[PDB]
Symmetry: D2
Amino acid sequence: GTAFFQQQQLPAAMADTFLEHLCLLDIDSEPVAARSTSIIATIGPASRSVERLKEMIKAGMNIARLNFSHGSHEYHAESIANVREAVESFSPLSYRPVAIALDTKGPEIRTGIEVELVKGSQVLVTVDPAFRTRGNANTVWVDYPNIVRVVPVGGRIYIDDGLISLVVQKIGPEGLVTQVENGGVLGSRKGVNLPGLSEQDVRDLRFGVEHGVDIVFASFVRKASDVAAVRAALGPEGHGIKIISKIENHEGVKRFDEILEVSDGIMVARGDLGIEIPAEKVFLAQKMMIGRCNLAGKPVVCATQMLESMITKPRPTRAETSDVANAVLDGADCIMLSGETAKGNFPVEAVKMQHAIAREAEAAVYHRQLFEELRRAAPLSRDPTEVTAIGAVEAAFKCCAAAIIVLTTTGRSAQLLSRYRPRAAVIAVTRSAQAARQVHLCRGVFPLLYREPPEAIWADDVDRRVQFGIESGKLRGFLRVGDLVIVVTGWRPGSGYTNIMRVLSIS
Amino acid sequence: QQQQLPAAMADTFLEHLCLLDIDSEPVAARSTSIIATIGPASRSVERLKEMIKAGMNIARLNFSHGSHEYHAESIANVREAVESFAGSPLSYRPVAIALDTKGPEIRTEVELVKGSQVLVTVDPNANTVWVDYPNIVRVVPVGGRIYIDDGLISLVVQKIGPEGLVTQVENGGVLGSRKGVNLPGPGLSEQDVRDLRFGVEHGVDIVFASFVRKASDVAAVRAALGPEGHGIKIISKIENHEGVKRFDEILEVSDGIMVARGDLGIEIPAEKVFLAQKMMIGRCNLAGKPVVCATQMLESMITKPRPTRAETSDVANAVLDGADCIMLSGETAKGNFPVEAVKMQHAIAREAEAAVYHRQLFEELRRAAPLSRDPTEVTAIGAVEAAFKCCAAAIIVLTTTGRSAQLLSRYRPRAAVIAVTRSAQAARQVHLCRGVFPLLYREPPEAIWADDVDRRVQFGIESGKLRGFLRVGDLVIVVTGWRPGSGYTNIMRVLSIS
Amino acid sequence: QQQQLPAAMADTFLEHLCLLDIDSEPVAARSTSIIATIGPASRSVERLKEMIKAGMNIARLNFSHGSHEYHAESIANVREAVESFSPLSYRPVAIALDTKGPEIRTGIEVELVKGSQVLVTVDPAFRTRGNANTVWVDYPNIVRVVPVGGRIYIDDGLISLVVQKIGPEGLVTQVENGGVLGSRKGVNLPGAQVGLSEQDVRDLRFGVEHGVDIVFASFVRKASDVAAVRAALGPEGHGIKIISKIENHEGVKRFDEILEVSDGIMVARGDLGIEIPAEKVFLAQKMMIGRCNLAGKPVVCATQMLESMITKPRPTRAETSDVANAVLDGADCIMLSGETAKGNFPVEAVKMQHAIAREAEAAVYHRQLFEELRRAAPLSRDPTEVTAIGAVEAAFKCCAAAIIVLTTTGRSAQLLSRYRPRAAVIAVTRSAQAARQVHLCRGVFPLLYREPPEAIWADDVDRRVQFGIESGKLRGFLRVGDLVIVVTGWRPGSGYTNIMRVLSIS
Amino acid sequence: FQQQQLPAAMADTFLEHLCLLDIDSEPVAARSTSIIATIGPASRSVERLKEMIKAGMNIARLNFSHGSHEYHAESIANVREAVESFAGSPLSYRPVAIALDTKGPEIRTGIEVELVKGSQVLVTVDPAFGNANTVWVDYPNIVRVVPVGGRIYIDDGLISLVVQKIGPEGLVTQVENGGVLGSRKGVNLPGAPGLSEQDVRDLRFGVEHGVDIVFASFVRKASDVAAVRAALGPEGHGIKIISKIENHEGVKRFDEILEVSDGIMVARGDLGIEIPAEKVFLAQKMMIGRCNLAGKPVVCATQMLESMITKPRPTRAETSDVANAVLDGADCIMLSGETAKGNFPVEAVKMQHAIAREAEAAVYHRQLFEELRRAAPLSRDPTEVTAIGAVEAAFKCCAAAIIVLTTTGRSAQLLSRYRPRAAVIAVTRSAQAARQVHLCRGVFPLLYREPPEAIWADDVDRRVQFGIESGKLRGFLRVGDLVIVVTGWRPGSGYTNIMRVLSIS
Ligand SMILES: O=P(O)(O)OC[C@H]1O[C@](O)(COP(=O)(O)O)[C@@H](O)[C@@H]1O
Ligand SMILES: [Mn+2]
Ligand SMILES: [Mn+2]
Ligand SMILES: [Mn+2]
Ligand SMILES: [Mn+2]
Ligand code: NA
Ligand code: NA
Ligand code: NA
Ligand code: NA
């Protein structure tokens, strides 16, 4: 009725230009739709307990990230065990699948085993076994022997989240002769940057296969062959696992297209990326990479220091809420929390804060422009799933459908709806517990795991799943009596046959 | 690429025009309907057969001339010609029959000399003209204007007496018998009401209502057609300044509109007609109601076997403006080349359809159509979106009344809208809508409704193959509904032709 | 609320159409030039004065007919008409020579019956012997270039023969499309294969001799056809503008290489609509006008625009539509042939084109047009181009009544016209020829300045701008309180335009 | 010339634009978004302010929440001394504006305890006053203007109490959000005052000390702006008033505020406590949008590079925040604690410079100019007319700059509102206008100091030559560049009507 069009930034939605849309953004216009941008929370000592995990799932965590940079196999087995128990130990219309993503250690370089490194200073960078625990104000040892044969004269070396810098002078036989460009206090075992896949990563990828992880975040992907190395390490048993390539450096930005082509998705890994390229350029790489993923219809994750101050403070800064909103307006499928959930004092509040901001920012999306641009740049398709998806999203915009309900075996039919960014929630009904977890990578897909064995008559089994979609949607607040819904199905069983879109009112 | 596809991809309208290619052949079936007017040149069954094969979709009966008996013969001859093709149900072409009302006509070789004196009289030569409108002598003041014969002659009153209007010939010419008079400076006539009842009793599909000036003119036509005539479509003829200015209230209550350019271009300056034409076409596109462009489109083809460069341009531009239907009057009613004229409108329309800039046109119509909770409208835009995504050869829709097909048509898909119906009247009537190709299905209902649905879809596909719309490997979008009876369309499916 | 301003501020093209208003009166001066063909109906000095008043801007001499002496007389009458009209009101009229070209004609009324046999003969002894079964053509090699099965069109494409055999006597044909055949009718051989004839060269040099402004060059198929015309004009004809007539398939397909070397284009629809299918002509027209608009070169739409006005005092609905749509397509000039050369209403035809063009100009959707022109022209470091676009934008922003430009060659005015300002472009020039020639560009109103140069160049510049203003006011273009944009340059001589100024009229 | 994100500039759609953004495309344009640095202990000394000016600071902010008039007088003199130390090179001198930021309706607490979540705490206004159970505040009428339950926020809104009861003791509350609490902290009462006598004495002090700009705190409606104007007096008529939008009413009444203000500050600190923190980006993008539309300067403020208070490099969210404020359309970006009190005030200015220059190059002009063009009304003002014509000319030829003469700043401001890519080099004899035009994105003021030439046209030309010469010295312009030059037909403000296209020799 009349109150409906005041909500979800609908006045700004029907503006005729982007600028007019911005002018019409309204802080009194409340979000209505379910929050659609998935939240990845990193597990660590602040978030390992089963009862804390349950608080985090209630708060809106959709994907748990296991950081293999730190912790033994046994430690990660216990984190996985806890997430499973939290998820299971909540009615099938209420159940929320949580994905498990393993994030590889990758090609880490660490310094040896506090000292002021002074800006005038003459630092030696040695790679000697012998100086491994001899770190002081003038010697940093590293765990990476080829560093001496790889950064020449001039040539800069970063230490500790890029906070300390060194420029090489001579290469004498004791190590690299540097001077401090940027000085500071240095602790032990800090990360080194120098603006394929290791034996540890392979053992970890195999461990993630043994434990059934849903997604791998692959570190430092530079080229297509890096993704193939991961796929090969996962092996035959790991064919179902999604590979999200982490773009962390210059080469991975430049070879982006070839990387996206062979990946399931992308992470903008802003931590390393902001040291490997100038900090002030990261937002260009982020925007470009999100836009190219949106175009390709493949999930993209924005990561790193999004709500960083909430490690120690219960409220985020103005820059942090902005960064989260802007990641969503950029077009990110997923937003991520690292220290904020792994080790901080406010892990649950950090999740609720990304949820609240993401909901606001999704309602602010200018669909009029975004849909037209997605459409007028996607190529023609003779694939019935794609053709149905675009017809289904169009139909939902025409009637302000509360949802599109899609049956899916692998997630693909839901993924192709998601790529057009409907305002309608995509309620994906599947039998596959793994597909249900994995579809959390796609903005606006709300997975529902259907547990019944098949009706004798296939068409009846289809109807029964669509009803389950409807009943879950109601229970969850997605749908009310009188809503229109778009229902997307196929003409026969099995993956790949989606070809039907139907307009239904909810009774 | 064929069908002007490289011009279709352009990023601006201006780039689109620059890419138009005279070698890019039309591939699509011709989608703008052709209305031909019946008369001595196009009335015999043998001639009408040739008209139908040349592409005539709507036969216009001009009630300005001809007795009822004459029009009954015209209707029967059209039906005999049309029915002669019924023995091949997958090829049969429904033809609508439109009754075009006489209207408020005023009617009068001799020379009218410029500057000479002419008495206009209604009292029961070069210097005196009689007219069948008695009240003319009291409704034209000094020095109001009297146009005569397609507005080619004009007089200006100087005096009013009981012998009638003393005028001066301002624009002179040669005057024959019983020519049209316009007085740009009545109701629904009594003859019109009798003609409307004739129309109902003879099962006409469409009425073209003359000189519609406001909404209550439309209501009087509906009232005259009566309860028996509820299913007849009313197309309002916009013929004068008042009809232009009251256009929105007229279109609101009408099934659609005719740009009646002959009277319009005497009633307003001839140089303003294209403005009225383009505005009314645009508004009718927006409203999703059929619009007809009429009058003098291929005029010289009355006597010449090929048209002038301006007539081919006028036809092409009427299509590019957005017209659902184009019309031929004296070109088929009385000329020497009625079949060649139909063929010529067919050929031009096909070229101009391919030239349509859908990219912008779809975006505009989509952006301006209001949100809708009606599942037929929702499914229509979804299907037309889908058709564009995969370059579908057709959209097959089942329809009882034509509505589901009209709602597809308003978005101007490039795919043909193949409308499968059991209603013979709906199949005739749907020719009002650009790009709808009606198929009349004659089989009694299958025992199981879902089978009955599928058989009609198959019938759509198999008619489409036979008619050259569809080949193996094409994609089509099928639009149906969830239960029997009109108003339940809600389903769109993507199907490959085998 | 005048000049379709409400439809001009629409957000989309379709909304713009929807708001077009027959009550909204044109206020701007009519910008699309009118080219009238000279003939027996329009040759008199009295008649020509009537036509210039009615709006004729360019007189076309049809070299398909009439001797040099006859054309010399036509030229003389146009000049005398123009001169026999007070410098603030003087109207230049260009003279365009339209070449005969590679015309094929029959010999010196009779009927050809569908299905009869007609010999087509090139035997000189048969020239005067045409009848129901015999047509002579002035093209001896026709026998070598139409194979059996090949088609020969006659009389504006109305009659059609198909060759059935070839012998000593000529082409034995069957009448495919019959009709009534007179004398000396045009013949088209669209199936066939074959530059500048000896006649066209004599005609062009006569053009140079009599100071014609513009050549309309027939059947241009390729860039070398334009070079042959420029060469034939020679040393003395360097200043003459060449408008290439696109009249057949090859001229359409080779259009871009033709435009690149031409001063502009004529869409010559008569032959074009025989040489390619009549139903495709509008596609060629709209493409060629669109491409001319993008390149900033003038384009003429021609032939049968108001054909019925040869014998009737008012045009058909199709004809008014065709004139309005040519303007809306982007034509710089529109044209009349038989309607002024031979018809009974030549003054009326000119008045009708003026009336329709003014209405159609006010219906131009400048919002989309200017953006698309802008966003597809390419970057330019030329100061005249940069100033032109700055000046047109400034005109739109304040609904200026005019852009007054000083121009030696016309170029600064042409680069303004290409952005289709709503504002009149009032072009002040000392060059009488440039003043004529710039009628080829839509919306340029040339004023010929006749006073010798002031001692001080800045004062000379300002006096020409004042003359621009006072003429503009006397002619109804400018009112007290109007804004105008004034475009000048930093030093004398062509090529140095670089300054735009915003001025109030008092 | 595929530098400055030029290949992304050529894209047909905004989405294609993002896709073509290239980390290898170097900015070439001078940085156009002005940087406001707050003065305080870390950035107050003459030698430090010289480094700040060299790093890019364009406007020094005096924060009147803290410090005596003596303090601020010294801050003003120090800035002038640092700025005038570069005056002996008039072809390179950088004018620096001084903005006085008012205290406003500040509530502070008493004179480091910790407030336990769910414990009871009395808020008191009894003169004879704290600790874990008692917080004193300097706003007597608080006890009267917060009903049960109603929320009290303390310390950048990190602590919150909910009132259960009102007694003569004051407000007995329960700690809703607990936290560690120190001396004299900011208090906010969302949904509860006038311009204060302190603020009036402060405005008069700013007038007497020639400040360029006032940032007026908590503007809630048009009459709040009239009150500032009245308090500046006749002597302060040329000071620019920048309204700070800091609460819900200010957002809702934004239009009547903008109408009477010289421009706007998105004062994110208070705004993000007064309305839900998650809604601030909506108010930010709306207010910037509307200020772009109106052609009036807008400032994004607060916590933009917060962590640089203590770290030499910012977080990934801070650099994104700066870049996005520029992309949103901000004329100026601000540093507060980062320069007033942090350990890296010069690095923080350098970082905002570096990020702004990148973000400026990524602006999608093709869309933004079209939108700004199509939405600006028709105008018969020759200055407006000439401005849009100069900006379209500058795009046609990728002009290196537009050089404009201006007395008040206005002709430069009307070029800046179309967001040219060309730098707007504004030559003026007015030292205050030269300072003030830093409020407008992409205006580089040049202060001209020579007496007028006898012949005015010569004087005009000489100032244009000086625009060029500074442009060349400063790296804006090279031999062969094209420039658009905007001048007027007579002396005195308001007659700009001429645009010329010139080659640089
Ligand atoms: O931007 P403002 O304040 O209107 O100033 C523009 C003024 O500057 C000038 O270019 C020079 O004026 P002065 O010679 O008075 O400085 C004028 O022609 C013009 O009106
Ligand atoms: Mn990393
Ligand atoms: Mn009529
Ligand atoms: Mn010709
Ligand atoms: Mn504040
Ligand atoms: Na990791
Ligand atoms: Na009739
Ligand atoms: Na000729
Ligand atoms: Na302050």
